[PDB]
Symmetry: C3
Subunit: 177 residues, 3 copies
């Protein structure tokens, strides 16, 4: 254990040195062991998709191609499946749910976990610290601004933000060339 700890620290030093030179960044220890693209592949996600070590993926989660799954994210498919499209940006700190335990806790542990399936289309952006709750359906080409709480379905080509989130305009201008 003495030697193992010393080896782990040596490895941390060397790997951080290598990552600074090669990738001009410094990551957590775990993100220097885990490759983002191989992890996504192991999870059955589409080609081009990437996911940080620090991400938690529960139950039935399906993800399309070229989707970026950021650090400190939760993709919870435990309550009937979560489906995410292609080309999505799932920003740092985003949490996507198909269950909750409000009643279980509030009832002293008696009530069951409530569950509902959740879907996000393609070409979406979920901004930092966005919370998407069970049951929600988000369409294609939606923007969800940072610090949102999405309680209801969102149709395609919408821009939403707030806690709770509300439709603010269409997303058309972000789709331009």
């Amino acid at each position: 254990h003495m030697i193992l700890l010393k080896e782990l620290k040596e490895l941390f030093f060397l790997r951080t040195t290598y990552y600074l030179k090669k990738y001009n960044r410094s990551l957590p220890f775990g993100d220097m062991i885990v490759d983002r693209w191989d992890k996504a592949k192991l999870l059955g996600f589409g080609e081009g998709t990437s996911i940080y070590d620090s991400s938690i993926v529960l139950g039935e989660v399906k993800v399309g191609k070229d989707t970026w799954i950021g650090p400190n994210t939760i993709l919870d498919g435990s309550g009937g499946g979560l489906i995410i499209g292609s080309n999505c940006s799932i920003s740092a700190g985003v949490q996507i749910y198909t269950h909750d335990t409000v009643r279980k806790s509030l009832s002293g542990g008696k009530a069951d976990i409530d569950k509902a399936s959740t879907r996000i289309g393609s070409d979406c952006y979920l901004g930092p610290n966005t919370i998407i709750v069970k049951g929600v359906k988000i369409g294609d080409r939606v923007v969800v601004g940072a610090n949102s709480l999405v309680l209801k379905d969102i149709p395609s080509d919408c821009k939403v933000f707030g806690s709770p989130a509300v439709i603010i305009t269409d997303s058309l201008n972000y789709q331009r060339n």
Copy 2:
């Protein structure tokens, strides 16, 4: 170090394979080493309590039975103790504090750290990304919605949300059977 890195990656691959088959989930590297229930036990928390590897626990923290401490949480008892009851849901990203450093920073490093003890009762839910500040007292059977900032005490059987958080109704209906 070359061999150690290769072994760590082999271990990551195998353990993720095992966790997918056994627990239908993919966790961070650290959460495949650390057992949530043994960690809680080591921290002196009550029977049935669980805490993710990614959680930070500072100073005097006491937790009751069957409380779920989620990923990416902060339980800071450094400023006079933090006490949490039984059957609580402490959601991903929740941060509970007994100190802050606004004045220390704002004063160029001169002022002291401000401190005040914090307590949460039993049968509470703290939703994702909830921030509870020093000095606060939350009673029993409270719901705190996602994305809240709790600046003042909350009595039992309340439902609160917002930044800052405000009482919205009672929590009675969540306690049903």
Copy 3:
């Protein structure tokens, strides 16, 4: 791998035991390997600065003296450099950006990443879960409250909060003696 996993768990147990006795806290596995002050030093940050293992630092990031970089933070200098002063508190969950990908995602992957440099002065506090977006300039002795989204420049001696953040008063009283 069998033996390596057993060794890692033994190390986790022992190190957590040592950290509880020596530092009265329990940290993630990675934060028991990585030293906060050596990591900051390796990143070229100023004397006295500290950064948790769980922090991500992208591209050109410069940080002054005695700045505290908390857990689960993002310091993204990838889009033209990020500069942070001395004596700053960068709270848990704070995310600071110099890029985004709204248009890249919304355009099916066609558009480029948008980039703009970001600066924060000295003696600032950024509260939990603060989001600072590309292009922003924050002056000296600013307070940013928890759960903020900072979309526009902030002058010195200001106190701001909200999503989006707005000036609420001056920060003078926090600077007192």
